[PDB]
Structures are given as structure tokens and as C-alpha cells.
Amino acid sequence: SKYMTPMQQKLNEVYEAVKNYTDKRGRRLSAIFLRLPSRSELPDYYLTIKKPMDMEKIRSHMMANKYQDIDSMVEDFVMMFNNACTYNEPESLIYKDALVLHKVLLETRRDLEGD
Ligand SMILES: CN(C)Cc1ccn2c1[nH]c(=O)c1c(Cl)cccc12
């Protein structure tokens, strides 16, 4: 069916709020987070990040209908943001963008608390 259940609609709304967020200059902060590069590209990344995560992984899990609740999706986004803030320096743009998208995530979930 093309009709999503209420839980599926809520998962999709959360995912899309993070994906689609743009700053005041029109930059889509999710860009860098869509797909993690390889070991070759980020030498230290897979040696230092225990549980790699990107938005394509979350999206595919969502599309396979494998998230049972909203907390489960939020957990994977929070993992991704913690990973970004572990690998990257606090002065880096990626670290700053992770912090903004984390707020988008939490604000979106809270604004759907009644739904
Ligand atoms: C270019 N550079 C130093 C880092 C870089 C470039 C790509 N990505 C990162 N760092 C990340 O942690 C990261 C995460 Cl969570 C998810 C997806 C992509 C990421």
C-alpha cells in the first residue's frame, strides 16, 4: 500500500526534518552526513569509531520498516552525531553542523509528542 501507518509517518517526518534542514544561507547541513566515506578516505575513522553510522543507513532501515518506534531512530541519529563530534574537532564545521542537526532532531520529536 502507498499509505503509511501513523508510526511510519512519524519516522518519516523525523528523518525528513533532519535531511531537509537548511540554514539561513540555504546550506543543507545534512549533506556531509548522507554517506560515510571509506577507510582509505578517512584513515583513522573506522579505527576510532566503534559503530559507524550515516543517514543512508538510517534511511534504509526505515524503508525496510525495521524501526519499531521513534526512540530507535533517534538513537541511531544520536550515534551519528556523537561519532561526528568524536572524530572531528570542536572548531570544525562538521562538528558544529552535528550540534545543530541534533537540536533539529530533538525539537522535531518534541513537536510531534502529541501526534
Ligand atoms: C572530512 N572529515 C574530516 C570528516 C567527515 C567527512 C564525512 N563524515 C565525516 N565525519 C563524520 O563523523 C561523518 C559522519 Cl558521523 C557521517 C557521515 C559522514 C561523516
Curated annotation (Swiss-Prot):
Compartments it resides in: Nucleus
Residue numbers of Phosphoserine PTMs: S38
Residues annotated as domain Bromo: 2-112
Tissue specificity comment: Widely expressed.
Record cross-link Glycyl lysine isopeptide (Lys-Gly) (interchain with G-Cter in SUMO2), residues: K2
Function: Involved in transcriptional activation and repression of select genes by chromatin remodeling (alteration of DNA-nucleosome topology). Required for the stability of the SWI/SNF chromatin remodeling complex SWI/SNF-B (PBAF). Acts as a negative regulator of cell proliferation.
Clinical condition linked: Renal cell carcinoma: Renal cell carcinoma is a heterogeneous group of sporadic or hereditary carcinoma derived from cells of the proximal renal tubular epithelium. It is subclassified into clear cell renal carcinoma (non-papillary carcinoma), papillary renal cell carcinoma, chromophobe renal cell carcinoma, collecting duct carcinoma with medullary carcinoma of the kidney, and unclassified renal cell carcinoma. Clear cell renal cell carcinoma is the most common subtype.
Record text on subunit structure and interactions: Component of the SWI/SNF-B (PBAF) chromatin remodeling complex, at least composed of SMARCA4/BRG1, SMARCB1/BAF47/SNF5, ACTL6A/BAF53A or ACTL6B/BAF53B, SMARCE1/BAF57, SMARCD1/BAF60A, SMARCD2/BAF60B, perhaps SMARCD3/BAF60C, SMARCC1/BAF155, SMARCC2/BAF170, PBRM1/BAF180, ARID2/BAF200 and actin. Interacts with PHF10/BAF45A. Interacts with acetylated 'Lys-14' of histone H3 (H3K14ac), and may also interact with other acetylated or methylated Lys residues on histone H3.
Protein name: Protein polybromo-1
Organism: Homo sapiens (Human)
